[PDB]
Amino acid sequence: LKWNKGYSLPNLLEVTDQQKELSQWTLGDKVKLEEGRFVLTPGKNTKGSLWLKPEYSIKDAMTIEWTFRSFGFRGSTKGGLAFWLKQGNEGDSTELFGGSSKKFNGLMILLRLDDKLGESVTAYLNDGTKDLDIESSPYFASCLFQYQDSMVPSTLRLTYNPLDNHLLKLQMDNRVCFQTRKVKFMSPFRIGTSAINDASKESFEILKMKLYDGVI
């Protein structure tokens, strides 16, 4: 019924000791906690990431909820915000939305201005044996979704139940974006988010993150 504190962000507003309360998280590149939320991309042409340090081992089912926003810029850009669920064998690199090597094993859910859909969520699967090329390489699922330049946060909710033959549901603001059974590897995996902006200074921000050891 309750969230796994070990694989969640603490209440960020209530954070008094950054070191202790975030000890399970790796802050990558330019990410900074400012006035109750993480700003992934606080400056012009910056990147930033939040990754859970411990790998997660699903028991029966799992729910991840990220609360995020993009503030300060509406217009054309190559920048975007990614949410990750990826198997091990690291070797760092941030070429893919401040978060990964073009070559990876797992799921990348991207909020960006897609050249053809516009503002959207697009979901990508890679198996570790290829270079994901955002233009060529296909997404397996998507929805149109307005995120640019809003103070009002959005919630991405990923539910996954291996016991229901790997049903994965992605909701945005409690509205279904997609459901699928094509994502199956979830063995332990790493959970995180990353973003990159450009000179227009889009501010990609994380306000909350909870993992639950079940479907809600």
Coordinates of C-alpha atoms in Angstrom, one line a residue:
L1 CA 0.0 0.0 0.0
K2 CA 2.9 2.3 0.9
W3 CA 6.0 3.3 -1.1
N4 CA 9.5 1.8 -1.0
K5 CA 11.5 4.6 0.7
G6 CA 14.7 2.9 -0.3
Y7 CA 13.9 3.4 -4.0
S8 CA 12.1 6.7 -3.8
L9 CA 13.1 10.4 -3.5
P10 CA 12.5 11.8 -0.1
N11 CA 10.1 14.8 0.2
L12 CA 12.4 17.4 -1.2
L13 CA 10.9 20.4 0.4
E14 CA 11.4 18.7 3.8
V15 CA 15.1 17.8 3.0
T16 CA 17.3 19.3 5.8
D17 CA 20.4 17.1 5.2
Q18 CA 21.0 16.6 1.5
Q19 CA 23.8 14.1 2.0
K20 CA 21.9 11.7 4.3
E21 CA 18.4 11.8 2.9
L22 CA 19.6 11.4 -0.8
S23 CA 22.3 8.9 -0.1
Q24 CA 20.6 6.3 -2.4
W25 CA 20.7 8.8 -5.4
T26 CA 23.5 9.8 -7.8
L27 CA 23.3 13.4 -9.0
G28 CA 24.7 13.7 -12.4
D29 CA 26.2 16.7 -14.3
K30 CA 24.4 19.9 -13.5
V31 CA 21.4 18.7 -11.5
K32 CA 20.7 20.8 -8.4
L33 CA 18.2 20.8 -5.6
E34 CA 16.7 24.3 -5.5
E35 CA 13.8 25.5 -3.4
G36 CA 12.1 22.1 -3.0
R37 CA 12.7 20.5 -6.5
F38 CA 15.6 19.2 -8.6
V39 CA 16.4 21.3 -11.7
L40 CA 18.0 18.9 -14.2
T41 CA 19.1 21.7 -16.7
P42 CA 19.6 24.9 -14.8
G43 CA 21.6 26.7 -17.4
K44 CA 22.1 27.2 -21.1
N45 CA 23.1 23.9 -22.9
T46 CA 23.2 21.9 -19.7
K47 CA 22.5 18.2 -18.9
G48 CA 21.6 16.6 -15.6
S49 CA 20.5 13.2 -14.2
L50 CA 19.2 11.5 -11.1
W51 CA 19.9 7.7 -10.9
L52 CA 19.1 5.3 -8.1
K53 CA 22.3 3.8 -6.8
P54 CA 20.9 0.3 -5.8
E55 CA 19.6 -1.9 -8.6
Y56 CA 15.9 -2.9 -8.1
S57 CA 14.6 -6.4 -8.0
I58 CA 11.0 -6.7 -8.8
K59 CA 9.0 -9.0 -6.4
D60 CA 5.5 -9.5 -8.0
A61 CA 4.7 -6.1 -9.5
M62 CA 5.9 -2.5 -9.4
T63 CA 4.8 1.1 -9.8
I64 CA 7.0 4.1 -10.5
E65 CA 5.7 7.6 -10.3
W66 CA 7.7 10.6 -11.4
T67 CA 6.4 14.2 -10.9
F68 CA 8.1 16.6 -13.3
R69 CA 7.7 19.7 -15.3
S70 CA 9.3 21.8 -18.0
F71 CA 9.3 25.5 -17.3
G72 CA 10.5 28.6 -19.0
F73 CA 10.6 27.7 -22.7
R74 CA 8.1 27.0 -25.4
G75 CA 9.4 26.6 -28.9
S76 CA 11.5 24.4 -31.2
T77 CA 14.4 22.5 -29.5
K78 CA 16.2 19.2 -29.6
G79 CA 16.3 19.0 -25.8
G80 CA 14.2 16.6 -23.9
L81 CA 13.4 14.7 -20.7
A82 CA 14.0 10.9 -20.4
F83 CA 12.9 8.3 -18.0
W84 CA 14.9 5.1 -17.8
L85 CA 14.6 1.5 -16.8
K86 CA 17.8 -0.2 -17.9
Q87 CA 19.8 -3.4 -17.3
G88 CA 23.4 -3.4 -16.1
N89 CA 26.8 -3.4 -17.7
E90 CA 27.3 0.3 -17.5
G91 CA 30.3 2.2 -18.9
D92 CA 29.1 5.8 -18.6
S93 CA 28.1 8.2 -21.4
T94 CA 25.4 10.9 -21.6
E95 CA 25.0 11.3 -25.4
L96 CA 21.3 10.2 -25.2
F97 CA 19.4 12.9 -23.4
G98 CA 22.0 13.4 -20.7
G99 CA 21.4 9.9 -19.5
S100 CA 23.0 7.1 -21.6
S101 CA 25.0 5.8 -24.5
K102 CA 23.1 5.5 -27.7
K103 CA 23.7 1.7 -27.1
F104 CA 21.8 0.4 -24.0
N105 CA 19.7 -2.4 -22.7
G106 CA 16.2 -1.5 -21.5
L107 CA 13.4 1.1 -21.8
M108 CA 13.7 4.9 -22.5
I109 CA 10.6 7.0 -22.2
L110 CA 11.2 10.4 -23.8
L111 CA 9.4 13.7 -23.5
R112 CA 10.4 15.9 -26.4
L113 CA 9.4 17.7 -29.6
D114 CA 9.5 14.8 -32.0
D115 CA 10.1 16.0 -35.6
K116 CA 6.9 14.3 -36.7
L117 CA 4.5 14.1 -33.6
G118 CA 5.3 17.3 -31.9
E119 CA 5.2 17.5 -28.1
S120 CA 4.9 13.8 -27.1
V121 CA 5.8 10.8 -25.0
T122 CA 7.7 8.2 -27.1
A123 CA 8.9 4.9 -25.8
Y124 CA 11.9 3.0 -27.0
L125 CA 13.3 -0.5 -26.3
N126 CA 16.9 -1.4 -26.9
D127 CA 18.6 -4.8 -26.1
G128 CA 22.2 -3.7 -25.8
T129 CA 23.3 -4.8 -29.3
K130 CA 22.6 -1.6 -31.3
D131 CA 22.9 2.2 -31.5
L132 CA 19.5 3.9 -31.0
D133 CA 19.2 6.6 -33.6
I134 CA 16.3 8.9 -32.6
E135 CA 15.5 9.7 -36.2
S136 CA 15.8 6.2 -37.7
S137 CA 15.3 3.8 -34.7
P138 CA 11.5 3.3 -34.0
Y139 CA 9.5 3.9 -30.8
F140 CA 7.1 1.0 -30.0
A141 CA 4.6 3.3 -28.4
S142 CA 3.6 7.0 -28.0
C143 CA 1.1 9.6 -27.2
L144 CA 0.7 13.3 -27.8
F145 CA 1.3 15.2 -24.5
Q146 CA 1.7 18.9 -23.8
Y147 CA 4.5 19.6 -21.3
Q148 CA 6.5 22.7 -22.4
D149 CA 6.4 25.9 -20.3
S150 CA 4.1 24.8 -17.4
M151 CA 4.4 25.5 -13.7
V152 CA 1.8 22.9 -13.1
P153 CA 3.5 19.6 -12.7
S154 CA 2.7 16.3 -14.5
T155 CA 2.9 12.8 -13.2
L156 CA 4.2 9.9 -15.2
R157 CA 3.0 6.6 -13.7
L158 CA 4.6 3.3 -15.0
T159 CA 3.0 0.1 -13.7
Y160 CA 4.5 -3.3 -14.6
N161 CA 3.2 -6.7 -13.7
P162 CA 5.2 -9.7 -14.9
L163 CA 2.5 -12.0 -13.5
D164 CA 0.0 -10.5 -15.9
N165 CA 2.2 -11.7 -18.8
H166 CA 4.4 -8.5 -18.5
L167 CA 1.6 -5.9 -18.8
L168 CA 3.2 -2.5 -18.8
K169 CA 0.9 0.6 -18.5
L170 CA 2.2 4.2 -18.8
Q171 CA -0.2 7.0 -17.7
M172 CA 0.4 10.7 -17.9
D173 CA -1.7 12.7 -15.5
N174 CA -3.8 9.5 -14.8
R175 CA -4.7 9.2 -18.5
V176 CA -3.4 6.2 -20.4
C177 CA -0.6 7.0 -22.9
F178 CA 0.1 3.4 -23.8
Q179 CA 0.0 -0.2 -22.6
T180 CA 2.1 -3.0 -23.9
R181 CA 3.5 -6.5 -23.2
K182 CA 6.7 -6.1 -25.3
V183 CA 8.9 -5.0 -22.3
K184 CA 9.8 -8.2 -20.4
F185 CA 13.4 -8.2 -19.0
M186 CA 12.3 -6.7 -15.6
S187 CA 16.4 -9.3 -13.4
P188 CA 17.6 -6.2 -11.6
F189 CA 17.6 -2.9 -13.4
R190 CA 18.6 0.7 -12.7
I191 CA 15.9 3.4 -12.4
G192 CA 16.6 7.1 -13.3
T193 CA 15.8 10.2 -15.3
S194 CA 17.9 12.7 -17.3
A195 CA 17.5 15.8 -19.4
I196 CA 19.4 18.1 -21.7
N197 CA 18.4 21.5 -23.0
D198 CA 19.9 24.1 -25.3
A199 CA 20.6 27.9 -25.3
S200 CA 16.9 28.7 -24.8
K201 CA 17.3 27.4 -21.2
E202 CA 14.4 25.0 -20.9
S203 CA 14.2 24.0 -17.2
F204 CA 13.4 20.3 -16.8
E205 CA 12.5 19.6 -13.2
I206 CA 11.8 16.7 -10.9
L207 CA 9.5 17.4 -8.0
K208 CA 8.8 13.9 -6.7
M209 CA 9.5 10.2 -7.3
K210 CA 8.0 7.1 -5.6
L211 CA 8.4 3.5 -6.3
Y212 CA 5.9 1.0 -5.0
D213 CA 6.5 -2.8 -4.7
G214 CA 3.1 -3.5 -6.3
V215 CA 0.3 -2.3 -8.6
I216 CA -2.0 0.4 -7.1

